[PDB]
Amino acid sequence: RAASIRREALQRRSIEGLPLDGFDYMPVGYIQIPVGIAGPLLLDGYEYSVPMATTEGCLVASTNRGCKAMFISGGATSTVLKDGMTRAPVVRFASARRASELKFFLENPENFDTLAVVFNRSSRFARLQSVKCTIAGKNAYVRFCCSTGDAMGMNMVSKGVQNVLEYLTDDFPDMDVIGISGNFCSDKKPAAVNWIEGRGKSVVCEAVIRGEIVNKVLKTSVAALVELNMLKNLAGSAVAGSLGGFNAHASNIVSAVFIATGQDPAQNVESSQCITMMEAINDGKDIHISVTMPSIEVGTVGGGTQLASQSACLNLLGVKGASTESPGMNARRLATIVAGAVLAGELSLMSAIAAGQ
Amino acid sequence: RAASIRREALQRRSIEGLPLDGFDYMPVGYIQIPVGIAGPLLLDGYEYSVPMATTEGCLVASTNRGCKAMFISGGATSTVLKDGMTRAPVVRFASARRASELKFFLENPENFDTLAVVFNRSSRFARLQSVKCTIAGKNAYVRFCCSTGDAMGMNMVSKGVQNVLEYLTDDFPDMDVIGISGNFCSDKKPAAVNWIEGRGKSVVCEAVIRGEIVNKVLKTSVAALVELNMLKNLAGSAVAGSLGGFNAHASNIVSAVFIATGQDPAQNVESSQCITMMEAINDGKDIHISVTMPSIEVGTVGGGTQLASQSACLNLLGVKGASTESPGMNARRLATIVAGAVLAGELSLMSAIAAGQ
Amino acid sequence: RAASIRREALQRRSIEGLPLDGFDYMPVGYIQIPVGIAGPLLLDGYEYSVPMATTEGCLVASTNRGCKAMFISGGATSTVLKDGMTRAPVVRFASARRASELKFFLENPENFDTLAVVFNRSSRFARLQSVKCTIAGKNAYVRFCCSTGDAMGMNMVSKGVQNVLEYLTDDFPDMDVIGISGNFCSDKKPAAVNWIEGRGKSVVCEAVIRGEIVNKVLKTSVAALVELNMLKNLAGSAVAGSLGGFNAHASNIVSAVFIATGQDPAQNVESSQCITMMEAINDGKDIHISVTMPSIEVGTVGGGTQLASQSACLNLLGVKGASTESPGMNARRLATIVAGAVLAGELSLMSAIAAGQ
Amino acid sequence: RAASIRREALQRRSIEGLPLDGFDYMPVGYIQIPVGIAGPLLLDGYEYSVPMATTEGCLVASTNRGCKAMFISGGATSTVLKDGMTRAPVVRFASARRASELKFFLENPENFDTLAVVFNRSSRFARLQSVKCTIAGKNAYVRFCCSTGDAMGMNMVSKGVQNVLEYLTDDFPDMDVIGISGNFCSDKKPAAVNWIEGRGKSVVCEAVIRGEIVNKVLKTSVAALVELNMLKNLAGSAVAGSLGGFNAHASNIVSAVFIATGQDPAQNVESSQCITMMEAINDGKDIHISVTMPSIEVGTVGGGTQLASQSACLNLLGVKGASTESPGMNARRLATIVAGAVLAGELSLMSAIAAGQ
Ligand SMILES: O=C(O)C[C@H](O)C[C@H](O)/C=C/c1c(C2CC2)nc2ccccc2c1-c1ccc(F)cc1
Ligand SMILES: O=C(O)C[C@H](O)C[C@H](O)/C=C/c1c(C2CC2)nc2ccccc2c1-c1ccc(F)cc1
Ligand SMILES: O=C(O)C[C@H](O)C[C@H](O)/C=C/c1c(C2CC2)nc2ccccc2c1-c1ccc(F)cc1
Ligand SMILES: O=C(O)C[C@H](O)C[C@H](O)/C=C/c1c(C2CC2)nc2ccccc2c1-c1ccc(F)cc1
């Protein structure tokens, strides 16, 4: 209604193509990104039609060729290694010695259940896992890690940090809270702390392609792919001084799935973090392929996940909304689907390159 | 038509919310992301209504508060430092000594005009700027850099690499082209080569906020902001082992503008690269604020830029399509608008945090 | 005797300057590095004459000027944040799922006392602190961390890894031990895992210089130094894409002390890791200066620590040999002396630069 | 004489072992490090007895086993890729736009011969190669690169920076020189700018070991070594978030040679930067092994190179003093000897690990 009057305000230059009617509502319209399907992606038993919101189009095709090569090869096996969202306030004291005392306090086992109880009023779903106090001079970067059910859970983890931050004025009234975020989290930035430590769902996803299928179907060899993986994704990314960028195009696939399933597209910068491994097995006859992804940040609940169209795309994958089984399970399964689509993407583009030789 | 029949194929589980009718066309539908406006953004003289495709909504508001604080403070001044898209094939020889000879050849000035002529049949718009051969053992990572007009120009730079790669079999028939990309570019990955060297448009954007406006309007002080910038964006990102992540949330703003203007959302991982500087000036009375962004990768031509809705959003900014003035100027101006919206974003969220103390 | 005959073998070109007589003994001689003294370094109460083995000479002077400025300013306060040496074997399995099972096993609390008992036959002094299994495809990088008394303790931690690696063939006979080191430790290399996680003694060291002393003695101001620290050591090292290099010259001081006290000079690459913080305190009247150093790797026992000359230099500092008080205390105190000399070094050179303006 | 009286001052606690007599002279004594020989190292035709100053002793043995395996395998071939020492002042202006104008000025070709003439009064040997102005907000980090003959040449490059910095007050009187170093050089710190760009001598060194020698002599296989190189030195260093640390122990060998030849042992942090490549050649029959080292910083002239003992060690290698042939050639040849000894070190320890399986 108003958003309709606000559009004519702006043209009084033309924003004519931008549709207004079609979406249920400071909005001035909406853009449209077409959705392609990659599948079947055979993953931990189940088949998935992977929705990919993208303009490219040759990317849906490329991810498709990868899902097929894995479909006839046994499919993919994902393993969730760690599941927990993080927020890291920077606080400070008058001294590093004093700041150290907050560290040793927070990192004492015997204090945990108290810090936990305080943190977990943040919601029904907040369950604090750990606290890592990093000291730099008289400043402390306190990394809180917690499970958050099927929500990506950034407000939740913040309600909880503030709970423990208020509770801490009892013992530490000299503490100055400089920021609710000190970039030690690290949110929507590439950071070693996320690579080393994990942020959100840390996933590994693997498949074995048989020599016969690498020749007949990918029109390359086991040895050519193992070598191209070492020279491009490992030695190449190393020579370029990459952080977490030891892969061919995880970012294309992660972005496309994120935008279709209504994730935060800015969290794609650390969610795209990936090492691609390609290892000759069975006296060089077959290839073991994996993606290891320490910081896939997704939810099936909240944000853009509950818009009509994005909701339809989660529902296709059967992860729409909170888990009935147990809270967190739909968000965990979404992460493995991303790791699986990434693995297919790596295999397709890595074969295309190696085959082109 | 077919895409309509393909949707029912998939439900034979429900993808009901996903709209089908509304977009002109393997598409199975399209998703809808609402567009907010941040402005006026006063930048290098002109005012802009900045389209931001996002679900958050508090992000459009936050970027708005920043554009206003800069509107009453003189507005922002952008400077384009470097403009050129890169592709880096990995080739190899039997020896490092032999690979060195390709390096010293390519990097000889007197060879450039020949390599240029060969490269520039890629299109009317391809103009090769440089070639940087990095040797690792007997492998060479040859970074080609070229201007590409108003197209982001990744196909163009590839047509050109292949031109020079074929031409090189004259002098180097022993060369094996292992990959058209060796991850030394580095495309859709965070890499030191992009931070150090630049990729696409390298922009700096700056404003001065007066003490009076920092107190009256941002409800903080000059000293509080300079300090929070050092502890969060500099010392914080350092303690976290960040690469290019010396900022608060460039990624939120870059993503939102990228998705609205039909850019490649996976290029957000290196386009979000940013150092935020906040420096007390005029005997501590005022604050100089900047973003330095070495790798903003955008075009106003091709890909998703020519869909109805994304086109309407570029046209709002007056950068839609190729430059009349001269090829490249619309893509350059789009980059500065991104740097300007990022600066507003940094100022808003950095003030909100500092003010909260 | 033989080493004397072996020298003439080599000249049959002249190695005449290289002394032979003077050292008690495949040695062919010995080189001589002159030792300077920086002090008094007033640190956690005590005064130290800091031995610095260096050719420069202007470096001993520069470190001296820093120790004096801190002597009249109250001296330095060190805090040991973490103390533990690490070794990280790479092992592998046929699958990532299988490799995950070693991770979840090792990282189960209830298994720790068993892994501990097995590990701690390595010596009287080996006390295992933790095990962090990082999975990459079907490979596992198992980071063992342990206290090792006053020895730097790299053989000790290795005897212990092999203990747990043999013990693991019970439950994991399918495990292949690919290497006793998989570069995830990371020994004598700069690595994010050491910055984020710590390796050996993690130290913070701090002093307050009064406005009066910054003007009268360092011939600069509080504001000039805070600013130069932000532009050089923080924004500068960031623009350069530094890892752990957020300081002016920790490496000069660490090297000089390491070579004099008979440490391993190749461990200087991660022992020099340092963030220098300089913060205005007391309404801008005074400056809080610190070094935070996550990976100082030293011992007072074994290796070159027990040569005549290197031993004399440890004995000057009163840390020579194993701790009577309790095992580890001399190696811990040596680390704080290094952090203190580094802080003096930073203050001296950072003042010299700022004063030169 | 005085240094003799200064020793008794300090004991009035015992520094008895530290020798006083034996060295020609604020010195209070000297320490002694024993020198071992690794060789013959067969490199670019010539044989070398490589002096290694180290306490370990098992390290000289390990480097010896590598030199022998290469002696019977054809020896090593080094290639110098780039030769130039760098200093990077941070200067600033009132604006980024203004700072940009210094960048575009300095980086204009037509200005170079003038900047060169000004720079090159620094000495007979200073020959300026390039200037790279990096802008961050209103600050500029100007990387000067120059040849410096056989001196490591850090004073020389500084005399030259100051020459151009004074000359710049003509055109840029508004410039503030904040520091003669802004950590963008980056001296005695690990930095992406050194990895990407090079600092001092950038060397590649390669050898081919035949299947027969890998079995008979190194007691492993071609395939085992290629694999261990990928899992340890590449995937391992990547998982650890390494910068320039894509090798097993370059730092051990670089340190040992640096200390014996009187180099600056603090420059070992960036001189140890290394990617180790191991590639199966000749239908998997043989192994191509290399080290690529972008920042070996050495001189044969000045500093500790002209002490009796360190001089004797350079003279063994035939690189002592300035080049007769042409200035720089002895310092260049020393770098290749370091790269060669590193390659031998990698081969020995990498074989020992792989063979242990
Ligand atoms: O390679 C990288 O470092 C990442 C890459 O840039 C991301 C980009 O979206 C992918 C581009 C791409 C694709 C896209 C379908 C995803 N398909 C191909 C099929 C056959 C042969 C090459 C390609 C290339 C392709 C074409 C030219 C290249 F130089 C590289 C890849
Ligand atoms: O801070 C960072 O490292 C990046 C951040 O995570 C990205 C995130 O999209 C921003 C979250 C955010 C916002 C969003 C409008 C963009 N607005 C605020 C307004 C007042 C106070 C805090 C915030 C926070 C906010 C709330 C809680 C926090 F912990 C941090 C920021
Ligand atoms: O600055 C850095 O990034 C690290 C530096 O390179 C390490 C080097 O050993 C130090 C060089 C140095 C020294 C040495 C005594 C340690 N003293 C000075 C005193 C007054 C003014 C400058 C200096 C400089 C000095 C001279 C010229 C410079 F460009 C920088 C520092
Ligand atoms: O591996 C790394 O990441 C680097 C390493 O730490 C540096 C260290 O100076 C080397 C230690 C070393 C050596 C030294 C002679 C240099 N020799 C061996 C011979 C046979 C088998 C193992 C080793 C190990 C050795 C022993 C135990 C290990 F865990 C690793 C290497």
Numbering used by the authors:
A (entry chain A), B (entry chain A), C (entry chain A), D (entry chain A): 198 to 209, 213 to 225, 235 to 566
Q: Paper's wording?
A:
HMGR (3-hydroxy-3-methylglutaryl-coenzyme A reductase) is the rate limiting enzyme of the eukaryotic mevalonate pathway successfully targeted by statins to treat hypercholesterolemia in humans. As HMGR inhibitors have been shown to be herbicidal, HMGR could represent a mode of action target for the development of herbicides. Here, we present the crystal structure of a HMGR from Arabidopsis thaliana (AtHMG1) which exhibits a wider active site than previously determined structures from different species. By contrast, the conserved extracellular domain of AtHMG1 shares ~54% sequence identity with HsHMGCR and strictly conserved catalytic residues.
